[PDB]
Design a protein around this ligand. Structure first.
Ligand code: NA
Ligand code: NA
Lengths: 208, 208
């Protein structure tokens, strides 16, 4: 039982998962992909192993892999196929990234390998037994947020593996592990609590 | 699958449940009790029926009922016995109230009829498949809150049945059903969203 969350913004993608429940693939300057899992270790490994089997050993050209997918919809279908086929060996996955010639895209993959895509209206997904802090994300998340502010919002909804992907870079450089002893994260959390109490103090003006 | 929440404050008790998942017993001027359930209808009815069976038909004086319990710990044990025995016919219950000569008290009852009591440090309980908005309650709930402000905080964590119990009154007069079309509740919720966005705008000053 773990939790993960991802945001699609105008400026790129942000991924976060606690504890690997965050998996990366990359061809420098051409494509990057991140998979987040909330299933047990066997489920995660089975899906990743199927993806990697086709990347490493596929002999049939017309069988699409993450590195031959012409766009992110097709890449999502690859992961969908792996998620469904891994049942042969009860959590959703999050999958996003970018392929050259197309904007960054983000998907939520269901157990049967069907999926939905993030939009400007619904710019984030949460997976896991508890979708921690969903109300705050619903109310505060906006698609025009800076990547760092999205990351901060995501972190407050929760060590945590955090990846910030900047649009059109086709690399994952901003990768970060944040522990419970991280003093920056504690300072942010304490300020958030103070701000919440102040926010509630304002709105208790209103009757119900 | 439903959600319920209760708060113990200096000034009394507040109970809320959505959809009866909120059950009331009373002897005017002597004792009041509220049970909240998050189980299915059969589980709730079984526990309530056992409580009522002993209130209505018990022939043995030494068998404690809600109306013979000398204090709220003993009353909690009565409910615990009903919760455990109802298994003979996977959710916690919340049970609180007041008996004359003692402060108001609030308990969370587990499947085996064991329980824990609310304290000034931990002044609330949540039950149900999803403990909606737990982070906000953890950060904002205080035991010295007015009953109405506690109610507002509880409502934001979510029709909803709301009971406010004022200390030493031994009656439940402030009983309220709040629908999705309630304009007061919509106004409160909209203000909360605005306040959250402002709270996040402040604290994004901090790095992580
Ligand atoms: Na905006
Ligand atoms: Na205080």
């Amino acid at each position: 039982g773990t939790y993960a969350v991802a945001f699609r913004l105008e400026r790129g993608l942000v991924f976060a998962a606690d504890t690997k429940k965050l998996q990366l693939w990359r061809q420098p300057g051409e494509r990057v992909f991140v998979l987040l899992s909330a299933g047990n270790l066997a489920a995660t490994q089975a899906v990743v192993s199927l993806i990697n089997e086709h990347l490493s050993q596929e002999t049939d050209d017309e069988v699409t892999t993450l590195f031959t997918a012409p766009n992110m919809y097709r890449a999502a279908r690859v992961v969908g196929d792996a998620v469904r086929e891994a049942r042969s060996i009860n959590t959703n996955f999050i999958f996003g990234g970018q392929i050259k010639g197309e904007r960054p895209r983000l998907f939520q993959i269901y157990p049967e390998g069907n999926f939905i895509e993030a939009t400007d209206d619904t710019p984030f997904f949460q997976i896991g037994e508890h979708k921690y802090g969903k109300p705050i994300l619903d109310r505060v998340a906006r698609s025009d947020m800076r990547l760092g502010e999205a990351a901060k919002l995501m972190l407050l909804s929760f060590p945590i593996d955090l990846v910030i992907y900047e649009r059109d870079t086709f690399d994952v450089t901003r990768e970060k592990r944040i522990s419970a002893d991280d003093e920056y994260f504690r300072n942010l959390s304490n300020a958030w609590s103070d701000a919440l109490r102040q926010a509630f103090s304002k709105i208790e003006e209103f009757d119900v």
